[PDB]
Symmetry: C3
Amino acid sequence: NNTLWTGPKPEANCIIEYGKQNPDSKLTLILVKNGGIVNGYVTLMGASDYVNTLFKNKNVSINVELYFDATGHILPDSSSLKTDLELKYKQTADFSARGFMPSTTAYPFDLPNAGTHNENYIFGQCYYKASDGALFPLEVTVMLNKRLPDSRTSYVMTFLWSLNAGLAPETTQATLITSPFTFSYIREDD
Amino acid sequence: NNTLWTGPKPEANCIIEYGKQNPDSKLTLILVKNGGIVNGYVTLMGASDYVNTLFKNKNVSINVELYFDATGHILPDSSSLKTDLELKYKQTADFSARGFMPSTTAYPFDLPNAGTHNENYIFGQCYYKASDGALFPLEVTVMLNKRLPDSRTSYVMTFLWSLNAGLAPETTQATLITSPFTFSYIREDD
Amino acid sequence: NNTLWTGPKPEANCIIEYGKQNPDSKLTLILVKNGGIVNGYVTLMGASDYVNTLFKNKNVSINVELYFDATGHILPDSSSLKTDLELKYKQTADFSARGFMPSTTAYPFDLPNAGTHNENYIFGQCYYKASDGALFPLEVTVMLNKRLPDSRTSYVMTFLWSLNAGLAPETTQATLITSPFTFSYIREDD
């Protein structure tokens, strides 16, 4: 069973809006083991009036933080994603997902008396297609481990999508859709 | 057997020129299953005087449409690709390739009384290296499902490569080569 | 055993500086078989004062050449990488790594009486994050096979990272880190 995911077309499961308590967006996240690497796939779909009016501004930053415990399960209290990932094929009760996690050898934490780790970032691009058909590039940053939010967390995966355009993509509400972004990282031992 | 492909160095198998009836280009397309995703690889090589003079213009659009039946086989009549894909390792007569297809749950069709689906696009870049060595970016769009061409088709995968440059890459015929483009998508159940 | 690599966090194993005889950089290279393709992952970390002051200039080119024998082992004499890759899981003495190599059918050599092969390049981008936080794009070229350095070599994989910026990213020494670059290619038979 080499796929850990949200499902292929999830209902609202993720919070983008600052201070909001209920899901307002649909995060599709898929992690597949392939030898010593995880191949990831991620897209975001908006599901509130707030998220679906972000692109009325020419500057947009969308942040999704995922925090995991020692067995690779989402900590929903602190994470943007409010439902744990699941194995495409069921396993025994609390089966470990540690082998899907980003390696703490390859991507360490910035602990107080260690030097800082800039090797923990993956950067790339995906896109937003506006109502009128025009395509806008979104700069993507994935941060692996590096910064613990609290003393309850073992692994970190964060996503930032950024738009700093000349003019707003939209002048009316429209479904926010990030085109799928693929990435690969060195995984923990099973 | 987890690879469905054209072979690694195919002879001319694809039609680019509008209205032409015989292959004028070599499409390399490779689809590998990896858990719940397909990892794809695609490149195009020109094989006619028409295709190999496209880049004498500063604006170029190259379209390849693939249409598949319910068991994941090419419909050659309507498709740009005129020979079905094959399994790297032979299977039994008309073995199904449905598990290589793009998911109709993740990437639905725009049917008459459904809203339209902009989540069905993957965008990226690959490149053309000109005769003089200069490198040109090609904008790539992959469309999955979304628009049926006719009532005989079950799955769709289309490719668009676009150049809108300041000056033409070429002033003489040269072999059109798109550098390889990789992409991943959520697949149908086997 | 489908992973051939440097290990996930190698010590200095690679030479960047022209004419230097000892390692001055840490190359992370990971090759995973996935059906008929290899999925690759590559990053470079500097480990000398020379490598870690390259980005004080606005124009930077970093070249890494890997040359392999008929069984897919590094030839260290000619290669930038001075230690052979290894299987994540041990095999029998001199187990062949030929199945990780780039296909000579898909990516041929430019031999004297053959036409030249521009289909042997993969191009893309990764990034350098400077001391002050500013992000710089690095143009990446991977060359597969194509040009033999000598008559002792069977396969070639070369990497070029290029920066031609408006202003230097750095004004003091800093650890050179290329953000991870992923690529896929058609592999040789096992």
